[PDB]
Amino acid sequence: NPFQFYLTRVSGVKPKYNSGALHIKDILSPLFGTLVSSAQFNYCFDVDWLVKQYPPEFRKKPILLVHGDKREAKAHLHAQAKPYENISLCQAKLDIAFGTHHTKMMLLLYEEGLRVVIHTSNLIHADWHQKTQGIWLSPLYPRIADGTHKSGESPTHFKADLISYLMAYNAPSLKEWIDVIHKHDLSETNVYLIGSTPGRFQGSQKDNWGHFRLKKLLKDHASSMPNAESWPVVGQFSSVGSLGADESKWLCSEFKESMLTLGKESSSVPLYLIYPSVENVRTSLEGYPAGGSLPYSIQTAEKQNWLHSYFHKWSAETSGRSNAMPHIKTYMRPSPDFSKIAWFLVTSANLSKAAWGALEKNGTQLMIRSYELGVLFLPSAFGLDSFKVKQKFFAPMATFPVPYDLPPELYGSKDRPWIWNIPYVKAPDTHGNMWVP
């Protein structure tokens, strides 16, 4: 395979379904490189746990934690890291209300080169234990020799785009990492970076971030096909924001419109949204506690019951992970019979305006509240017109490993979306327990 897309290891599936999965301990192993320094971008951290995932010989190498916590939460994180003198922290600025630092990324500097890991897991034990999570592993990027002048740039512009993403933090610890990236050759990179950063973007900057970034890439580097209106859009996520009083206010206006872009030429496109039902969660490996990582509040949901008609159950027989609740987020464009896809995105971005951006000022400005990061797989970046869907995830190799089942299955009439702050007391979970928030 050329895609280097992995799932995390799941405790409690047959070994067949972890062959070619990665634990965090595998990613940080000396076999991946001799670590000199690392940066861990994430949302939440168990620092004691995190240090123990590094090889013992690497545990005193510098670590930078990039987070968005403020006030007492920030103090709690500093207290966590205080026993480790090699740990530094970078507080990502969140100057728009209700924003989050969701981006999950490792920068791994080695004696041998540099690696970038863009993934979906928090740095806590539960996120790597029994959840479905996604990982993109960059190649080992070699250092550009001193005195050599070359860009180190890929046909997907990944090196400049990652530097641009880091530049938006305006942080001195991240300028150091930008200078590291400058000295390495990233030209083998075959994915496109799609980031979100907080701000209000107008003019050309509108295309830099969020769903306008996706739209720009699809217009520039994908082609439309006959019957394109028959190719569905699939979105798959672990958290749901307030989308408005009906589908026209954001979901099916600007968001779907960016998602259905293909090529430069100018809607009945089916939209499938995949989000765990209550029954998905109850019968999962973790039981109801899996719902602690599926944040959808009743206050949000009761204002948009229209949305739940779009919802499809989580099912992942293809990867043996139907009972491993998803914390991965993915978006893709399958063919009408789901046998091919026009592109695939793995990201931190949930189904929210905060993550993807909402148009403001008469459609001229894109406002984004949060930091998000994902990578986009486009057939053109691999010399292809489309990707064939891998029928069994772990089983040619121009075949893309979609980690859950197609077509997605609509909720039944008795199903309900998982809502994390209401009780479930009708039927016990796989550990014998109810859910009482």
Ligand X SMILES: O=C(O)c1ccc(Nc2c(-c3ccc(CCOCc4ccc(-c5ccccn5)cc4)cc3)nc3cc(-c4ccccc4)ccn23)cc1C(=O)O
From the list 40-48, 175-183, 255-263, 302-310, the region that binds ligand X by CB under 6 A is 40-48
Instruction: Determine contact, residues 154/191, Cβ cutoff 8 Å.
Output: no
Residue 295 binds ligand X, judged by CB under 6 A: yes
Residue 207 binds ligand X, judged by CB under 6 A: no
Which listed residue (53, 122, 190, 208) binds ligand X by CB under 6 A?
122
Return d(Cα 207, Cα 219) in angstroms, integer.
11
Return d(Cα 24, Cα 295) in angstroms, integer.
24
How far is residue 270 CA from its own chain's centroid?
23
What six digits make up the tokens of 147? 């005195």
* Shortest spacing between CB 418 and ligand X, in angstroms: 11
Nearest partner of 130 among 20, 51, 18, 53, judged by Cα: 18
User: Scanning the structure block, which residue is given the tokens 């550009």?
Assistant: 144
The answer to whether residue 182 is catalytic is: no
* Closest to ligand X by CB, 192 or 418: 418
- How many chain residues touch ligand X (CB under 6 A)? 12
One character per residue 234-263, x = contact with ligand X (rule: CB under 6 A)? ----xx------------------------
- Omega before 407 within 30 of 0, i.e. cis: yes
* Closest to ligand X by CB, 98 or 306: 98
Which listed residue (8, 38, 40, 100) binds ligand X by CB under 6 A?
100
From the list 41-49, 50-58, 155-163, 309-317, the region that binds ligand X by CB under 6 A is 41-49
Catalytic choice (102, 119, 184, 312): 102
* Shortest spacing between CB 73 and ligand X, in angstroms: 9
Q: In 296-419, which residue ranges form alpha helices assigned H by DSSP? A: 298-301, 353-356
From the list 42-50, 60-68, 202-210, 274-282, the region that binds ligand X by CB under 6 A is 42-50
Q: Is 345 exposed, middle or buried (0-12, 13-18, 19+ CB in 10 A)?
A: buried
Q: What is the DSSP string of 49-66?
A: HHHHHS-GGGTTS-EEEE
Buried b or exposed e, range 112-140, using 16+ CB within 10 angstroms: ebbbbbbbbbbbbebbbbbbbbbbbbbbe
The answer to whether residue 327 is catalytic is: yes
* Closest to ligand X by CB, 327 or 390: 327
DSSP state of 119: E
From the list 83-91, 98-106, 129-137, 273-281, the region that binds ligand X by CB under 6 A is 98-106
Residue 350 binds ligand X, judged by CB under 6 A: yes
Q: Which residues are catalytic?
A: 102, 327
**Residues contributing to the site for ligand X (CB under 6 A):** 43-44, 46, 98, 100, 102, 122, 124, 238-239, 295, 350
Binding residues for substrate, as ranges, are 104, 329
